[PDB]
Backbone:
């Protein structure tokens, strides 16, 4: 009765999303040929499922979390009768208008998925309330409990995933509202809460935040997101090394010379620089993303492939890492480039005067155990640099004999961005006319055995839906991870080291490239 | 017409690529090689004059085996422009140049993709009629050689002389004395090298005798015992992949390797030449000489250079650690008629005696006993009239039982050198199809060598040693002491076979061989993917 108006405005705006995602020569025919085009998985369905997204119209939820859920709906990884609930403080007039202009503008690839698009919005309902009012959680508890019992399944109760797409200052009170008014029925079901970075800003900050949530949810239920890490690149580190004797036997200090984990991004902080100015490149991606990546490379053998034995080795090996020292660190801060297409970092009005905040840093970490003593581990992240390339690179020790200068170090690389790739660099015979044994030429050998593809974030959200806690930092490791970085962070705030300038689009400060070369890395030539 | 005469030009390259290389998962091969072609975009042998004398010039080997080989090297530019080749045999030749076109040129490869390059080559060939023992006839040869050495416009003195003995071994001792007394290179300069052909004795004492008969005339720097089945391409796979790369160098020992199998297969029978084989046996045919040389290259310790005689130093080095093969560690076979009937039995041959215990098939276990190899079983297998035609290396590394259990099996490196060359490492990887579990794995194959040039029909295996001998490369040729240590490994077994203590088990052609043999491989550390 309400809105035949909103029903078409939804139809027209999906078609407008496609005309600007596939630029049409003949717009008139695109709007029309794609007009009528919009015409054990045993255990998904055992019980009903509800996804509650808080901060539902915040920038994080609308632009990254709800569109993520859309991709799983099209991929068929969500149960058929899932319901999603958007939770936000501000009221909305008619919700279906809100779905078409707050949620659906940010759904990507709508020319392959557009027919599913307006079906997807039928699974989301809106709920307006406060993140601290126990009564509104009793009204939320009522609204979800009335579709849990409307469930067509064999087995009763319901499973509840609460996504806190909120700033961290709100976390402790939303987790109290769940405990006192929104826990799943004892008739059956689990509760899992996904919490978002920043998980503190140093050792004491993050122990306090984790102690605020301790009485409300244990580690079996809390899922700390690191949405820059994907399932694709974690089974590369675990399966290639631990199922294969070729790599398992060579994965130590007796054969490895240098390990570098590199995170590059071509874009700086466009207009959110003031928000970054309090973070720093270390806190943004290094302490969380690159360190969990590093945890998987250096871990001893987990005595199972169960989630908590993998996480068990992540704490054991991070506990052997000596905290970064100020001499072992180089920082940069990006300025305007000679191209002129990017303004400087300080050319942003959002950032205060004269701040020494780094947009680029490279550091050395020394793992102290039998397996890794002596091997330098190099972490590098930088904003507004030459290219967008996140990759792992391991350099094995050179076989100087007998080939001398006819061979160089074997190299294993794992790349996650822009495109996934895994390959090893080795020296092989050249099919010379006469040939020669001294005439070799380095080659690249692939290790990947190549329909909708889920990104890193979707298969992290799906990992939480399936009960897989492997790729989420857990309480003890988050603390020991912080204890690694904060002595450096404290000394940087004290100004004991200062950032070195570099213009954007360059590789970064050239003292950083010097630091890499002086710490066991050898370049092809 | 419109650029896809070019596009069909490089699925042409992939078509030849996939059927030279058993993928069995052809699908990602053609892709992983479609994208590897994305990134694919000697003065001194005029120093001296060169003369090649091939004995037995109209013997069956020389006309069919060696003369066509030299022709292919002529087109490859691997022979000097002023090269002199002379055929030496006694048989009557009234007209010589007619004899070259129509006893020699009928066996020249390709014949018309070359163009008239065939008749250019034959113009470097001369005939010489004489006896393999007449010291006077060699002084007449020395004169005719000095009359082709003197036609050289080089600055350089002298001439280089390569004598190819396309003869049975009983003639060897007399032509090497005849060369010594009347046909050695000029004193002004040049080397002499002798290539002697396949059967070097038939046991320790037979072959020791033949080498002391040649000892007084030529040292190991001058004698080149040829084995046409090795080839440079596969020894550069064995040597370079392991010794230039720490990934493989560190796992190339007993602590990571479980089983290595060297296999020689042929679909062909004795071709009716059976009586001829009957005194040789498959062990002497390919196992003691060819596959043992292959095994030597896999198991050798690090040579402290890549010079030929430091490589050979490590080859006799490791063969000295092999306990002699024992008969309990051996099973033999003999091929019979096929179920199709397309291959007749070995004994269905008129050339072979009744009641012969000659093996057409053998698989054995060898124990290399030193720090690097103690415990690792080495399995040699040779067979005629079997499933398929392939010589290949199979090395199986020990399984990582934990943590992947039955989601993984043993890692495998294989080297297969043929017309069907291939090198690949087979290991377990994640499957990208997200049902997002780790136990959810699949073994796949990873190639290291691709066929990218294809400009060519470049040197085959046999053509690569002749060229190696011209270049002074002793690497793929067995040495006096090394030939001895190889015989001492096999001859206790060979005597017991001739004494009949073990006999060959019957098998039909086209099958894998005797069924007791495959069980023997299974009982000696070998595991099937399943």
Residues:
């Amino acid at each position: 009765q309400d809105a035949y108006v909103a029903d078409v405005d939804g139809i027209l705006d999906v078609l407008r999303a496609q005309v600007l995602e596939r630029k049409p020569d003949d717009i008139f025919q695109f709007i029309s040929k794609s007009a009528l085009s919009l015409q054990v998985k045993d255990e998904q369905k055992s019980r009903a499922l509800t996804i509650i997204v808080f901060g539902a119209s915040g920038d994080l939820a609308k632009k990254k979390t709800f569109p993520a859920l859309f991709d799983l709906y099209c991929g068929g990884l969500l149960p058929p009768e899932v319901n999603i609930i958007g939770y936000a403080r501000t009221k909305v007039d008619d919700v279906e208008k809100w779905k078409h202009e707050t949620l659906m503008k940010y759904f990507s690839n709508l020319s392959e998925r557009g027919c599913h698009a307006e079906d997807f919005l039928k699974h989301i309902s809106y709920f307006c309330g406060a993140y601290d009012s126990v009564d509104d959680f009793k009204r939320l508890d009522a609204v979800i409990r009335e579709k849990e019992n409307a469930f067509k399944g064999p087995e009763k109760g319901g499973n509840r995933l609460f996504y806190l797409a909120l700033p961290p200052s709100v976390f402790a009170s939303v987790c109290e509202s769940i405990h006192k008014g929104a826990m799943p029925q004892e008739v059956g079901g689990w509760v899992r809460v996904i919490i978002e970075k920043p998980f503190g800003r140093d050792t004491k900050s993050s122990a306090e935040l984790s102690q605020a949530l301790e009485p409300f949810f244990d580690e079996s239920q809390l899922y700390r997101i690191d949405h820059y890490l994907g399932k694709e690149m974690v089974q590369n580190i675990i399966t290639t090394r631990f199922a294969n004797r070729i790599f398992s036997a060579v994965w130590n200090a007796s054969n490895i010379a240098c390990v570098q984990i590199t995170f590059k991004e071509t874009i700086g902080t466009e207009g959110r620089g003031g928000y970054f100015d309090n973070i720093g490149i270390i806190r943004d991606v290094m302490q969380n993303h690159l360190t969990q990546i590093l945890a998987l490379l250096a871990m001893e053998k987990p005595r199972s492939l169960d989630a908590e034995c993998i996480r068990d080795e992540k704490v054991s090996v991070l506990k052997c890492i000596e905290p970064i020292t100020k001499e072992n660190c180089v920082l940069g801060q990006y300025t305007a480039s000679a191209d002129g297409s990017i303004p400087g970092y300080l050319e942003d009005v959002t950032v205060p005067e004269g701040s020494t905040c780094p947009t680029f840093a490279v550091m050395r970490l020394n793992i102290n155990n039998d397996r890794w003593a002596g091997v330098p581990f190099i972490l590098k992240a930088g904003k507004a640099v030459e290219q967008k390339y996140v990759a792992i690179r391991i350099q094995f020790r050179d076989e100087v004999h007998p080939y001398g200068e006819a061979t160089q170090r074997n190299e294993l690389v794992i790349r996650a961005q822009p495109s996934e790739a895994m390959y090893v660099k080795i020296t092989t015979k050249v099919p010379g006319l006469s040939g020669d044994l001294r005439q070799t030429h380095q080659t690249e050998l692939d290790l990947t055995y190549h329909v909708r593809l889920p990104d890193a974030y979707e298969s992290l959200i799906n990992d939480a839906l399936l009960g897989n806690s492997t790729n989420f930092v857990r309480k003890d490791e988050l603390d020991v991870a912080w204890r690694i970085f904060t002595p450096l962070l404290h000394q940087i705030d004290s100004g004991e080291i200062k950032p070195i300038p570099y213009q954007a689009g360059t590789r970064g400060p050239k003292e950083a490239d010097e630091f890499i070369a002086n710490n066991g890395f050898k370049h092809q030539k």
Notes: DSSP finds 16 helices and 15 strands in chain A.
